[PDB]
Design a protein around this ligand. Structure first.
Ligand code: MG
Ligand code: MG
Lengths: 432, 165
RNA sequence: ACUGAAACUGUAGUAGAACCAAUCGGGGUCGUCAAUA
RNA sequence: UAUUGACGACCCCGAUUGGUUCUACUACAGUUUC
C-alpha cells in the first residue's frame, strides 16, 4: 500500500519555472511552436515514504528488501523528464514497524502500542544489493568562454542574466540537463546524418529529431502507427539521462535578488555583485567572477551605434562548475535490442564519438555560443560502469586524452569495427 | 452562508477557490475571443497585418507580469512601465495602441479594476460569509495574470489570421 | 393472514515519451544649430 | 549683395517562437446461498 505524500519545499524556497525550447536542427534556431515551460519542485524538497506491506508469509520478501536498498541508493526516479534532469529521489531515515496481526498480542499492538521496531541494518546485512547495468560518465570541465544559460526574461541594470536555481539554503548557477542533453543529441544526429549524407532541411522539427541510434540513446516521442496492419508505438524513453549541473559558487537567495534588482550598472549593481561574488570590498576580484559587458550594434553607413541597439550581459566569466553527470542505462538499451549485446557497440561507438567532440571544443553549451560564450575545456572524462557485459568491461576508465586514446586500442578498434559495419548498412538496430 | 465560526469554514474555502479559479479562467477565455475587448482591456489592436504593439512588446510585458505573485509585487510591474515610459523609442512603440500603457498601469495598480473587466457574478460561487471580499483580495494577482495571459494568446492567434490573408 | 436475511462499485494501471531558452548585433563616434542685415 | 557667432553629446535594448505530436480508458465480476 502506497499513500499520498505531501511535498514540503525548503524554507523560503518556492516552485521554479523551467523554460524549454526546441531548436530546429537545420537553422539552429528555436522551432516554431516549440516553446514551453515547466514548474518543478526544487532540489532538496522532502516528502514522507508511506509504505505498508501485508505479509501472508513469514519474514519480508527479499525483492521488497532490494527495493528499499535501491531507494536508499537513490536508484529510483519519479515523475516527468526523467532523462532531462528531473526526478531523482533518495531515501533517508528508514524505519520499520512490524505488527503481528495474526495474534492477540499483535492485533492489540496495532490498536494501541504502535508496533515492534526492526533494525533495518540487520536486514540490510542479509542481502547484496544488485545494481543493474549502467555506465556513468563524469565530465570534468571549466568554461573557456563564459558559459551560461539565459534567465527567463530581461533584467533592469543587466538585460541578460544567468539562470540560477535553489539548492537548499543557497542559489547556484545551473545548466539544466535539458540543455546538456540537447547539445549532445544535436551532435549525435549531425554525425549520423553526416555519415549517411541525409539532409535535414525538408523535415519539420518532430521528423528532424527521429533518426537511427539516437532514437534509442536519446529516445523518441510516443507515436502510435498502424505500420503493418499491426499497430505499433514508435515511442521509447531515452536510455541516456543527464543531470542539472550547478556552479561551485553559491549565493544566498537575497544576495542574488540584489543582483536581479540592481538598476545602475555603475551604481547599486556594484555593491550587489561584490556581495554575491564573495569579494564585498574588492570589485576588481568581484568582476573576475561575474563581469558586466556592454554591446552595441553599429550602423553600417554612419558608424556610431544603431538607435536602440544597446544591451548588456552579466557574463559569468569566472564561475567554476561541477563535473557533468551522464547516466547511460545499459539495461534499457539491451532490452531495446532484445538482449543482443553485439548491438550495443554501434550505440556505444556513437556515444564515444560524441564525447570526443565535446572534449575537442566542438560542442559549445548555453547562450550566445556564436557571440562570445559557451566554449568549454574538458579536463577529464571518467567512465564508471557497473555490471557491464564482459566485452564492454574495458569502458571502466578515467580518460584525459580528448581523443579517447586512454581506451584500449583493441577495444577502440573493436568498436570501430562494429560501428563501420553499421555504417555499411544503417538498419534500425532494434528491429528484431 | 456558513457562519464565520463554523468548523467547516476552512473546508468550504477550499471549494470556493476552486469554483472561483475555474470561473475566472473560463471568463478570461471568452473576453480574449473578441478584438474589441482586448482593445478595451489592454489597448492592444490589429491594424492590417501589423500588431500594436509588436508581439515582442507584449511578450516583454508578460514576462514581467509573471513576477506579480501578490499585490505587494505591483511595484515590480509598475517599475517596468515607468522605465519603459522613460525611454522615448520604447514608449513610442506603444503609440497607435488605445492608451495601452496607462491601461496596463491601471489594471495593475487599481485593485478593483480586474473584477470589473471580468464581470463575474461570484454570488453562486461563494458560501463562506465574507467570502467575496476575502477571495477577491487573495485571487487578485492570479486573475490579473490569467486575464493578461488569455488576452495576449487570443491576440496572437487572431494576428495569425490577419497575417495569413 | 405480516418488511427476507447477508453482500465495500471494487481489483490491476508512474500524466508520461520526445523537445538546447535560443538566434542576430564591434561599447561605438564630428558638424551641426539659430536668421537675418 | 553675404554676412552674424561658438557651442554640443547620443543610444539604454530591438525582432521572434509562447507550446507541438502520441495515448483518451483497457481487462473484468452482471448476481450470490454445499
Ligand atoms: Mg536598462
Ligand atoms: Mg539595454
Amino acid at each position: 500500500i502506497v499513500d499520498d505524500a505531501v511535498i514540503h519545499i525548503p524554507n523560503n524556497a518556492d516552485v521554479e519555472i523551467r523554460e524549454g525550447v526546441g531548436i530546429d536542427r537545420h537553422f539552429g534556431t528555436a522551432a516554431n511552436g516549440f516553446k514551453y515551460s515547466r514548474a518543478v519542485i526544487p532540489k532538496g524538497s522532502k516528502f514522507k515514504l508511506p509504505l505498508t506491506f501485508d505479509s501472508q508469509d513469514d519474514g519480508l520478501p527479499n525483492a521488497l528488501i532490494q527495493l528499499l536498498c535501491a531507494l536508499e541508493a537513490g536508484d529510483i526516479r519519479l515523475g516527468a523528464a526523467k532523462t532531462r534532469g528531473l526526478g531523482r529521489i533518495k531515501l533517508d531515515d528508514l524505519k520499520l514497524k512490524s505488527f503481528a496481526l495474526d495474534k492477540p498480542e499483535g492485533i492489540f499492538s496495532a490498536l494501541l502500542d504502535q508496533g515492534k521496531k526492526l533494525d533495518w541494518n540487520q536486514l540490510k546485512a542479509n542481502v547484496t544489493y544488485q545494481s543493474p547495468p549502467y555506465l556513468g560518465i563524469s565530465i570534468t570541465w571549466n568554461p573557456k568562454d563564459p558559459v551560461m544559460v539565459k534567465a527567463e526574461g530581461d533584467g533592469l541594470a543587466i538585460d541578460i542574466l544567468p539562470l540560477v536555481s535553489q539548492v537548499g539554503s543557497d542559489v547556484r548557477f545551473v545548466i539544466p540537463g535539458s540543455s546538456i542533453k540537447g547539445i549532445l543529441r544535436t551532435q549525435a544526429e549531425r554525425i549520423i546524418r553526416t555519415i549517411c549524407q541525409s539532409n535535414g532541411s525538408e523535415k519539420n522539427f518532430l521528423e528532424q529529431l527521429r533518426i537511427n541510434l539516437v532514437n534509442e540513446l536519446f529516445g523518441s516521442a510516443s507515436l502510435s502507427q498502424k505500420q503493418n496492419g499491426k499497430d505499433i508505438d514508435l515511442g521509447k524513453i531515452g536510455a541516456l539521462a543527464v543531470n542539472d549541473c550547478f556552479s561551485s559558487l553559491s549565493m544566498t537567495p537575497d544576495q542574488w535578488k540584489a543582483v536581479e534588482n540592481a538598476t545602475e550598472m555603475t551604481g547599486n549593481l556594484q555593491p550587489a555583485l561584490k556581495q554575491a561574488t564573495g569579494y564585498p570590498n574588492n570589485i576588481s576580484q568581484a568582476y573576475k567572477v561575474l563581469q558586466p559587458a556592454m554591446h552595441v550594434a553599429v550602423d553600417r553607413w554612419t558608424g556610431g551605434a544603431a538607435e536602440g541597439m544597446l544591451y548588456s550581459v552579466l557574463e559569468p566569466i569566472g564561475v567554476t562548475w561541477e563535473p557533468i553527470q551522464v547516466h547511460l542505462d545499459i539495461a534499457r538499451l539491451k532490452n531495446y535490442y532484445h538482449g543482443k549485446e553485439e548491438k550495443l557497440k554501434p550505440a556505444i561507438a556513437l556515444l564515444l564519438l560524441v564525447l570526443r567532440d565535446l572534449a575537442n571544443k566542438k560542442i559549445p553549451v548555453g547562450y550566445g555560443t556564436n557571440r562570445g560564450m559557451g566554449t568549454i575545456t574538458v579536463s577529464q572524462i571518467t567512465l564508471n560502469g557497473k555490471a557491464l557485459p564482459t566485452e564492454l568491461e574495458p569502458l571502466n576508465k578515467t580518460m584525459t586524452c580528448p581523443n579517447l586514446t586512454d581506451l584500449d586500442e583493441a577495444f577502440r578498434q573493436d568498436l570501430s569495427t562494429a560501428w563501420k559495419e553499421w555504417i555499411a548498412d544503417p538498419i534500425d538496430l532494434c528491429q528484431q | 452562508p456558513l457562519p464565520t465560526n463554523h468548523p467547516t469554514q476552512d473546508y468550504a474555502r477550499l471549494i470556493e477557490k476552486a469554483a472561483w479559479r475555474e470561473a475566472i479562467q473560463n471568463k478570461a477565455l471568452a473576453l480574449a475571443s473578441s478584438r474589441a475587448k482586448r482593445e478595451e482591456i489592454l489597448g492592444i489592436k490589429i491594424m492590417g497585418k501589423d500588431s500594436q504593439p509588436t508581439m515582442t512588446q507584449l511578450g516583454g510585458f508578460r514576462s514581467v507580469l509573471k513576477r506579480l505573485h501578490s499585490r505587494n509585487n505591483r511595484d515590480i510591474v509598475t517599475g517596468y512601465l515607468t522605465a519603459l515610459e522613460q525611454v522615448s523609442n520604447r514608449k513610442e512603440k506603444w503609440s497607435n495602441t488605445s492608451q495601452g500603457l496607462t491601461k496596463i498601469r491601471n489594471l495593475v495598480t487599481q485593485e478593483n479594476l480586474i473584477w470589473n473587466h471580468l464581470d463575474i457574478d461570484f454570488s453562486p460561487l461563494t458560501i463562506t460569509q465574507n467570502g467575496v471580499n476575502q477571495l477577491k483580495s487573495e485571487l487578485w494577482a492570479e486573475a490579473v495574470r490569467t486575464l493578461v495571459d488569455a488576452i495576449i494568446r487570443g491576440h496572437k492567434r487572431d494576428l495569425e489570421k490577419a497575417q495569413e490573408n
